[PDB]
From Swiss-Prot, chains A, B:
Protein known as: Membrane-associated protein Vipp1
Function in brief: Required for thylakoid formation.
Compartment(s): Cell inner membrane
Highest taxon, organism lineage: Bacteria
Organism: Synechocystis sp. (strain ATCC 27184 / PCC 6803 / Kazusa)
Family: Belongs to the PspA/Vipp/IM30 family.
Mutant lacking the gene: phenotype: Essential, it cannot be completely disrupted. Cells with very low levels of protein have no ordered thylakoids, are barely green and are non-photosynthetic.
Length: 53, 53
């Protein structure tokens, strides 16, 4: 009984941990995409911006 | 739902970026052509211009 309720609580902690890491991975990739989008936008702002070389 | 609307906005940004780059490429080539036309015109202005060697 002690091992089963211990293991159950630990399993709950494992599930929570995994869910949070899955979230973090999703958020990390969309930030990479938005960063790359910003970089692309900057290069167009440069070439098609004002005057210069 | 969050991933789909995020991805949709990012896809819109990608489409806009690509359209602007396609435009830039078109404009770049017609400028190369007009530059080369000007250079050709200059060589005729030289040979068939005034006096000299
Ligand atoms: N004569 C110019 N006109 C506009 N931009 C220039 C010029 N010369 C250089 N730049 C470059 O283009 C960028 C224009 O600044 P930015 O804030 O993007 O323009 P805006 O304030 O109109 O959005 C600057 O970072 C600068 O490095
Ligand atoms: N005697 C000359 N008459 C005309 N052009 C000359 C003469 N000697 C040299 N050139 C060259 O030909 C060019 C004539 O100048 P340009 O402004 O093209 O003529 P226009 O003002 O009649 O259009 C000059 O760049 C110059 O280098």
């Amino acid at each position: 009984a002690q091992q089963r309720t211990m293991s159950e609580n630990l399993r709950r902690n494992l599930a929570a941990l995994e869910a949070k890491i899955s979230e973090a991975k999703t958020k990390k990739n969309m930030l990479q995409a938005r960063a790359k989008a910003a970089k692309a936008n900057a290069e167009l702002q440069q070439t098609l911006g004002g005057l210069g070389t």
